[PDB]
What we know:
The structure is cut from a larger assembly and holds three copies of chain A. By secondary structure, chain A is α+β, with helices and mostly antiparallel strands. Helix content of chain A is 31%, strand content 13%. Chain A is elongated. Chains in contact: A-B, A-C. The A-C interface holds A 33, 36-37, 40, 44, 280, 350-353, 385, 387, 555, 559, 561-562, 564, 649, 654 and C 1-3, 5-11. Chain A: GO terms for molecular function: structural molecule activity.
Amino acid sequence: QRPERIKTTPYLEGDVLSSDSGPLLSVFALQEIMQKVRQVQADYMTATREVDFTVPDVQKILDDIKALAAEQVYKIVKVPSISFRHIVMQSRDRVLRVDTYYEEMSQVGDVITEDEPEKFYSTIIKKVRFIRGKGSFILHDIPTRDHRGMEVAEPEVLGVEFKNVLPVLTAEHRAMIQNALDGSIIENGNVATRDVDVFIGACSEPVYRIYNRLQGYIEAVQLQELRNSIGWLERLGHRKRITYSQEVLTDFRRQDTIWVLALQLPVNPQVVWDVPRSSIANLIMNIATCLPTGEYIAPNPRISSITLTQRITTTGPFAILTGSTPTAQQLNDVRKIYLALMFPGQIILDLKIDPGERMDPAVRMVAGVVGHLLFTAGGRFTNLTQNMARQLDIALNDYLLYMYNTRVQVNYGPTGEPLDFQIGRNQYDCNVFRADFATGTGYNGWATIDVEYREPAPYVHAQRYIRYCGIDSRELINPTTYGIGMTYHCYNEMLRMLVAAGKDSEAAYFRSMLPFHMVRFARINQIINEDLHSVFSLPDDMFNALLPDLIAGAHQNADPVVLDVSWISLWFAFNRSFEPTHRNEMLEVAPLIESVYASELSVMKVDMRHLSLMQRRFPDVLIQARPSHFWKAVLNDSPEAVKAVMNLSHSHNFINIRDMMRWVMLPSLQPSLKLALEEEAWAAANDFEDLMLTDQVYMHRDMLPEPRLDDIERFRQEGFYYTNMLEAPPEIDRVVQYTYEIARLQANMGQFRAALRRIMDDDDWVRFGGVLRTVRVKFYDARPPDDVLQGLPFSYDTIKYATETTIFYLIYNVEFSNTPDSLVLINPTYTMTKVFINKRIVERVRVGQILAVLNRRFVAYKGKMRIMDITQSLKMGTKLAAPTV
Amino acid sequence: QANMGQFRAALRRIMDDDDWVRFGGVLRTVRVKFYDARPPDDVLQGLPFSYDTNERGGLAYATIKYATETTIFYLIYNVEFSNTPDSLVLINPTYTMTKV
Amino acid sequence: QEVLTDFRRQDTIWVLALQLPVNPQVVWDVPRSSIANLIMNIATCLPTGE
């Protein structure tokens, strides 16, 4: 079924030794990093915070990111929001209207105090989610009716509740609004098959502003944007060589189906690689979704030995090594080497010294040869640390000199470094196999260009093609040299010094293993740059700085994890191949998983960016604020499936203040539909008056008004009412400004009560600006209690400066037997709190201006329409019919 | 052509001009049959292609497959003594749509 | 080198109570100590053989 996995000659046939996969290694690669820190913190005295090192179910996290693509942030309703009501007074021609959007705006959070900053941030972020949740509707299948030919709307599909006002009107005013109730006609409804409903209703201004943004998304995001989406998935599937089906996609849009499209497929990969301390979490999220299920393959057993007649057989040189079987700990270490060859600069290796084991002394010497022709210490990347590359030379120095045949001559050099001699009769210089990390002299990549750029990658951040030992993935298909001439320079020099040093039977083993060796690397190259090409791969800006920061010891933000393997596992890893059987199960669905995860990251960045300025604007509400406060706030108002990806290496406990502040100030945004609503909802909350909290709270002594009634009905029909809310604030002169610091210094000195009464007796106005306060609106027909009358903008405890205020509406209801001076007392009553909002919340109007709020243009749909989502259909297996130019 | 919905409308226009169409270039193995009376509805007008449209989530996919087997058939006529000359001639002809 | 190597090595404070390259004059300054620095050389570094 694939041209590189058809074996004709029986050279690549061997026993299956093991089998590993994607979700098996990603659990294993996390159970080896966390067991290294829990090991070396249990042997030495560590003084650190008690953090836990556990391993999450990585298979479950990959399902919940996939499940997060099946949510609709909008909602489909038949009627719109009401957002308006009226309170009937004692009058018969004047009622006062109540906007219920500002009523529900108050009771979504808590009372904002000046003490706790992390509750203030969660109270703010609760209010922004209220505007996003309320004003996201579609208005499908509204009910209507016919009235004298003209197509008019139902009385309930507007935004006015008038059920309580009808018994108090006169017979004139009932028909005066009935001619206006039938004036809300559907626009050009006389023609059939319009496919839309246009009428005029009434909704509040922040709720109406997001509703236009939801229509403007469907205005633009359409079949052309789906044409751009599948056109990128064909470019990824072109590289990954995935077999297509016969079924193609035709862009035929039905007459009654409307598509929404929340996500876009070309993901800006800088958003994923900007999360702080996420270099390990972006590695396990690459193993868990792009490794193919494969099997380890032993070589052909007739490579070493030939049987001549019956009892005359060639004996291999490494016979006691081939006659061995790895234990469970040593087979674990082969899975660390093949996890280090596939991820070149990201996973390095070391030695794992343990004293409770007495191996053969010849296993260390042979493993010095194998490591010099399996790993890479070249000038482009490295698989082995600068200490393991040192300990693989002393193992070679203790192998080229342990001569068990007759002694060849050897001329040592002036230094005392390992491998400084000239072994052999023809005196081969052995200095070249000592590792130098700037040119890679001993190991692979000696004279080989092993990293190259051939064509632009679908992903714009990884244009590299890894070619281990100068071998391309096409040499399994169209070879260039014969079977004898399969070689490369890093291996061939190892043979012609192993021959020159008297070991001319050991080199005959490695010379007959070159075609198995180069076939191994022809599949590692076909795994890296064909299957492991994701968003979570390492970008080329970081990949070209891993080696020159390993040498100079500089602080790197992409610290490669160092696993460690034993000595004999260099031999067991030499004799396996990892021929992949099937590709991964979630390979085609993974671009949807990367796009859901990256879009949900960018909605957190815009919430943290707007919340970061709340100390620079109102510095007196937040004295005890630090940037870790809103970091906990937006994380709590976030899906838990995304936080499982960010906290894979437990990076949530190890990041400091200056790391989270940098990620806020970084320009990288993955767009979506939800970001097009959240960025809009922060525009309508930039003044905080639509969130029902403000700083302009005044305090001024005023008496309750005594109305001098002479006619009962004229006192009734005007609608007399008292309200502490201002209509216009006082001037810049004749006002005294306080601050939080000014009142705090006078409260402990005791002069605060003394300085107030001189102001409260000389007819001046004092302002308590600087700190925002929760505003609640109340209505009262009888006398309200005195805690509402002589309530204070502050409180006692020192003082509290962020006490919640109250707006009370005192309406008068009198009877026929009321004395005209019955409301006159000998001593009056006083009120103190007065507040300015600059919002027309509650205002007394006439009956002629009841339906004067019908000015909201609405666009609705017919009942035959279907609102369908097509975000689930973004898979790699779909090839569309007409290809994109 | 099927993306613009003009696939079956184009093929009807090629047949209405009395023109010829050719599909692909696959080697198209040949079977040979013989008939003495009334070959069935699949030998005549045997369509050498297939066009089927499916819809998943309101997307209107389509599958187009070219056939690979062709049939060369031979139609031997058989007449009898009790046949009038205006019996074999029909009011509208039966169409054959396979040429090898 | 299995201690300088785990993934917390970027932010770690290594405290070391003993410098390793010993100035060997301070061992050979103990007066008339030539036998004690021979019994200690035997009972630390002498290998057992056949």
